């Protein structure tokens, strides 16, 4: 039994690879084939403690945890095979008032999802975990219905499933080489023979880096060491009838679960103390490392062993049977890389799982869906394999991983900042200049200004669930833009040059807006076949046949991958260039933005010569620039595209030419306050693959009646005619000391009816502003709803958008 022909080759028989093989086979894919080096579970999967909780601190990752657990509950009936899924529920513990607030943060974030999650009181916690030291316990965050599973059994069950549905699981069959073919398919080599696969999937655990290099890619991954401790029988545990729920001690930084008649607990020690396999990155995985563990090291986790002994008194008396120390494949930010990989054909990855046991199930069905449908079933850009790039070096990878381990259980504040491995190489000289004058934000490698420091006001990282030190500065920056002229570094934008004979034809089929004529620029969306908003671009037509596409920083390679894929698919004759790192961008915006820039260029900038959305090459003080009259602030202004190495000089001249008009800097926190005022939508908050552009209110950029048959045109017609179920709205609400930021529950008459997608304090009306999705029947101007912020419901009204008109709408009303 050997196929040389396969639809899909899955490399690696960990829980993740096998889960995928199962899903694809069951979904009806023919000739699925998984290749495993040695035996199923041989990597990290066999050693795990198999905690599986419904809890996640993000958003759509909740779906992954959800699908995995629902799957796991079914498998025993489905496959005839036992999986040893224990479901006593999980509790995360709060011992401080800031930790209670974190639980409130998470509740508003979870109340609009089907995941079941509550904040429980001490008395209840003690009812469920009677061996808990209740001295300092203030509250628990409780997910009933989860717990932990046996990773061996899980995977074995999944494999019988896979086989039952037609997959072929071959081992020992290690992949040794990989060769792309001109038609987009792959030759795979193993010691049992060749397979010609239509597509390949890397699921190779801590070998996933090595497998990437067989095809010339550097996967930013590093195996770390993690340890859990297993105790002997404990009378008081044996004595119970019901299993103890799984705990997380957030302050002690360890998880803990019942294990037979004893306990198992696992620290996340400090970034300074943790260990990782940098030697395995430099020289690769030792061959013959299989099914094996590292030597135990209690000493380096002692501080967490102690906290645990005091939180569970019973541990003081018990003995330690065993300590499991094994590797986990981390990516820098702790999340995996799941999806099709940019810049090669038909390569997919499901790699670098901090939490593969809990993610396997959901990721299987997620990837399966993406593979079969050509688009993901819901948005998980946060796992996009190409959120990383050449800036994600081994040195960075190694240092961020360490931080992400050590930070496992620290308090997760909104607008969190982390400093490890920064700055990367992905900066201009502008960094040097502005670093000490602002809080720099990290964005896919770049250092971009969030907010600027004010004299006589605190400048330090000061995280909070409520308003903090940047609140006042952000209001001044907001003022600065409405009253004078602000300068913002927008250099992180994703930038692509498209030319060749089919440039126009390609774009016309990708994007739902008309393609602007040469000299002009518009906003345009790439939709999926089903009509989801895969991306928002701004499209500049620069010379006949030649274009610049601009996108958000988080969408760089994600958008490129899609465009490259469509160009190839329709045999389009074009040349696509990623010029992201070649260029810097400065936004100059506010009423005095013409007056200032005029001083620096012989080009005529009057509203006469130079209209809104036009693009023109010029020189700004002997520095060549591509000037687009646009601004996401919605105030008068330009974006100035230039060489990276000029960004300092250009900045310098601009700021100097603006003394008189009182020019100053502004950053992204302010920007958000401004665009939100103008009812501007933001890709990734107001729309992504979970949204069609009509429910999001992007009707103005969607030309259904343009000739070309662009991706999603028909799905859109069908949606429009079936009538909307929900709509994005703009909401105002008064608050004491907190602003919506998005992902908060919207309530109406005692029930959750939707969610906020983003938000900010509006400094002009002295109230908070949000964007939210609500049911249509409740989307009228004037409608009253409640918005849950940090455990309190605040009333809110829907308003007529926009709250403030753009400068071009204001200007063109002055004539009429
Ligand atoms: C070490 C550890 C990990 C762990 C844990 C506790 C400890 C001490 N507790 C966990 C938990 O409570 N909950 C959870 O969700 N995860 C937990 N983990 C981590 C977990 O083990 C991993 O996240 C997960 O097992 C990763 O699975 P994945 O399928 O991604 O990778 P793998 O299990 O290592 O399997 C990789 C397989 O691919 C094969 N391979 C390697 N090279 C090749 C080649 N060249 N060709 C074909 N196949 C290959 C390997 O043999 C391996 O079996």
UniProtKB/TrEMBL annotation:
Its cofactor is FAD. GO terms for cellular component: mitochondrion. Its main location: mitochondrion. Residues 435-706 form the GCVT N-terminal domain. Residues 726-804 form the Aminomethyltransferase C-terminal domain. It catalyses: (6S)-5,6,7,8-tetrahydrofolyl-(gamma-L-Glu)(n) + N,N-dimethylglycine + oxidized [electron-transfer flavoprotein] + H(+) = (6R)-5,10-methylenetetrahydrofolyl-(gamma-L-Glu)(n) + sarcosine + reduced [electron-transfer flavoprotein]. Keywords: Acetylation, FAD, Flavoprotein, Mitochondrion, Oxidoreductase, Transit peptide. One of its GO terms (biological process) is choline metabolic process. Transmembrane segments: none annotated. Its EC number is 1.5.8.4. Residues 8-370 form the FAD dependent oxidoreductase domain. Belongs to the GcvT family. This is Dimethylglycine dehydrogenase, mitochondrial. The lineage of its organism: Eukaryota, Metazoa, Chordata, Craniata, Vertebrata. The gene is Dmgdh.
